[PDB]
């Protein structure tokens, strides 16, 4: 490891057109000093591999403001208006990549694995290709995504994804020792850790340099072999994107709450599912940005920029919580270790296809495709029954882009609960009291079985 | 996590024929109490996925003695004569699996990845098929391995490997908290960590159970989500397989000059490791160990000996300041990714274009390849062979084509013997660059099984000071 005092000296040899991996999830664990140094060098035409686009004026957004980025590879690019303008104008190329795929592709690039198979994205636009990566200024398509190859293993379909490597990685960490060993704080680890292993030249900024021996050797998150250049960051702003401090929907929330079992591991999406946790039993909440054991929103003095949920909100953790990297988080999710994934949806098909990431009128799929990728995890959709004008949301075939094929196991609406089977279809198992089966029939765009043991829809006390 | 007070209760439902992942590297980080519990249940016809099989009379070796294992999936037999015997005799099935492949296939099994590509094993019996899985009584092959698919990426050839999962995993860890989070000590982590993630039911034995809060949340090695059953081990013997307590010299003193300041190196048993003793205090070289250590130091004094800290040769070792520990999947990610600068190792044969044979002699040496196929798998890592020039009877070790099974094709960059140093080009062959003083080129021609170029700048063989 070579130590630098001046962040610019550490990045001055990045050539124009370089591929650069940039750590962070939202504004959590972003290499703000190294980004600042690139603003000074003015290096341009970059391909940035970055999970998100920061915000307009921070993180990766700063490099968009200066027009130093040509292309991005990312999983979710919302909350950045500059990004949107450039992309729509044909000034920016963008490959939206499932978050778990992004993490594993980066890992593969550090591990000597050129390609691997994953369930994530099978049956979606990721597999099919053809999505706009770049527009022209007149609104025509300049560059479209390529398909992914499909192969069956053990009776299930998977797609082939290839390793990502960079010329450089810009990584944020918490502490380094004088040998160059590095550690990460709370949920700021995320993509920083795997990105440390996947570039020709890795540049790490830390908040503090400590004596050799300050770490237990077992608790070094990134060994020095991966840390080519190290700089102590001059300034840390501790910016917080979303400061979070402590009837149709309530009906859904109060039924969704009854899906929780004692000892359960769950991942809860933004909105109704997370609100359902307030009504919970020991239930361990997982966060795809690398947390197990999420707790309630903080009191003001518990607020910490290094600890957010997947919705980018400030959060807390409970006793016996753990933190881990984005590649590890999605290994946990893709391997079916989470018992229950609960999420919102725009549409669900008769056999359990899910559309919940794109409305043709673009932000990216985030971790949604990974979350529904394993048959071992129960996937429960919580949504209002029908859209505007009693337009069907549950129907024969989705009309909106798929998150996953045949992946939903249960649907909870304000009117009904359905069990879903890939081969057998839908079964109505609960019915909001007062409603009839014919009411459900009129608000549902496909047939369903009615359970002999049908009951009024349950509500958490 | 479900907690148990009796190890047998934790494992009573393993059925005959089950596939069981078993933690450990030699005798380091082995689940000795869970192995004891299986001795009591008598479960049989197992397929045991484990790097090694302990020693004859400890670790997984105990389950070979009791004939409870049908097939081993392993990287190296090591110093277990009974393992070696049962395999050669046709009593035991063994899939000799490159150690980094083993580790990655297990990781894949926990991570939702059914298959992936690796260069490890390309151009060898692993890729080609024909690795003996079961022998006949007469030494012919009853069951041969099947070929692995080959695919080219980025101008290099790779092979397809498939995920490994178990019905059960038997894992040794150091501490668990009352929530079921688990940590590992020193180099006892090895395969235990990825095996935790890759079975239908994971059973972890620990030395201590501690309060929730005993761990920093950043420093939990295996989060509780992976730990289905937890027991505190009743007995820990802290056994040590190999107590190492603090012309060949010519090879060692030349090999010592391969070291550069700042270098990361992986040094094989024997000559390469002995060369590290001649590294100047003015130079910084960091030694990596494939069982999950970075920063190996000298052999320990008695009071420094620790059963949780051994090198790849299974010798008790120490570490230097600023060392780190990591799992076997991470260790081989480090190696296959080309992060190590120098791999130095011995060989039985090397071809003129850099093919290496160092793992098998049909009907004689059948212990496995360990991590050697992985260690020579990256074009970013320099590979130096250190070996005696000729074999018994002046039989050639350097030749046009190896006669023994390959560890790797066109992977060696330099050969150091007591007589010569050769640079190796995969297209142009060998160039004699140094010659031991007193020897002539004809001396080399007589003791070498192929032709070679002689450098215009040939110098006498150098020796470290
Ligand atoms: Cl070994």
Swiss-Prot record, chain B:
It catalyses: a 3-oxo acid + succinyl-CoA = a 3-oxoacyl-CoA + succinate; acetoacetate + succinyl-CoA = acetoacetyl-CoA + succinate. Its main location: mitochondrion. The keyword Mitochondrion applies. The modification Phosphoserine is found at residue 131. Keywords: Lipid metabolism, Mitochondrion, Phosphoprotein, Transferase, Transit peptide. Changing residue 196 to S: Similar specific activity to wild-type. GO terms for molecular function: protein homodimerization activity; succinyl-CoA:3-oxo-acid CoA-transferase activity. The active site is at residue 290. Changing residue 28 to S: Decreases KM for acetoacetate and acetoacetyl-CoA 2-fold. Increases KM for succinate 2-fold. Decreases KM for succinyl-CoA nearly 4-fold. Strongly reduces catalytic activity. Homodimer. Only one subunit is competent to transfer the CoA moiety to the acceptor carboxylate (3-oxo acid). This is Succinyl-CoA:3-ketoacid coenzyme A transferase 1, mitochondrial. It comes from Sus scrofa (Pig). The gene is OXCT1.
């Amino acid at each position: 490891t070579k130590f630098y005092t001046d962040a610019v000296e550490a990045v001055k040899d990045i050539p124009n057109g370089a591929t650069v991996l940039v750590g962070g999830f939202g504004l959590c664990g972003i290499p703000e000093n190294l980004i600042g140094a690139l603003l000074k060098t003015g290096v341009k035409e970059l391909t940035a591999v970055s999970n998100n686009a920061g915000v307009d004026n921070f993180g990766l957004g700063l490099l968009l403001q200066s027009k130093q980025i040509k292309r991005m590879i990312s999983s979710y690019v919302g909350e950045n208006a500059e990004f949107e303008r450039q992309y729509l104008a044909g000034e920016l190329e963008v490959e939206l990549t499932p978050q778990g795929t992004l993490a594993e592709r980066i890992r593969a690039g550090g591990a000597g694995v050129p390609a691997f198979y994953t369930s994530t994205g099978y049956g979606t636009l990721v597999q099919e290709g053809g999505s706009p990566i770049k527009y022209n200024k007149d609104g025509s398509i300049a560059i479209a995504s390529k398909p992914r190859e499909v192969r069956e293993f053990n009776g299930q379909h998977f797609i082939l994804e290839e390793a990502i490597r960079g010329d450089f990685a810009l990584v944020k960490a918490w502490k380094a020792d004088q040998a160059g060993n590095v550690t990460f704080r709370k949920s700021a680890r995320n993509f920083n850790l795997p990105m440390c292993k996947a570039a020709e030249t890795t540049v790490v900024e830390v908040e503090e340099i400590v004596d050799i021996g300050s770490f237990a050797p077992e608790d070094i998150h990134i060994p020095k072999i991966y840390v080519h250049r190290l700089v102590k960051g001059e300034k840390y702003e501790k910016r917080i994107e979303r400061l979070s401090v402590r009837n149709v929907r309530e009906r859904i929330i109060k039924r969704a709450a009854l899906e929780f079992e004692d000892g359960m591991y769950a991942n809860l999406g933004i909105g109704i599912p997370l609100l359902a946790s307030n009504f919970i039993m020991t239930v361990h909440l997982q966060s795809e940005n690398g947390i197990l054991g999420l707790g309630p929103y903080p009191l003001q003095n518990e607020v910490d920029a290094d600890l957010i949920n997947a919705g980018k909100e400030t959060v807390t953790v409970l006793p016996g919580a753990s933190y881990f990297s984005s590649d590890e988080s999605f290994a946990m999710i893709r391997g079916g270790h989470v018992n229950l994934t609960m999420l919102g949806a725009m549409q669900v098909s008769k056999y359990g296809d899910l559309a919940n990431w794109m409305i043709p009128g673009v932000k990216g799929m985030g971790g949604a495709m990974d979350l529904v990728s394993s048959a071992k995890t129960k996937v429960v959709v919580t949504m209002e029954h029908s859209a505007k004008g009693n337009a069907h949301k549950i129907m024969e075939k989705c009309t909106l882009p798929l998150t996953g094929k045949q992946c939903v196991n249960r649907i909870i609406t304000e009117k009904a609960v359905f069990d879903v089977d890939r081969k057998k279809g839908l079964t109505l198992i609960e019915l909001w009291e007062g409603l009839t089966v014919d009411d459900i029939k009129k608000s549902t765009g496909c047939d369903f079985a009615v359970s002999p043991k049908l009951i009024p829809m349950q509500q958490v006390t």
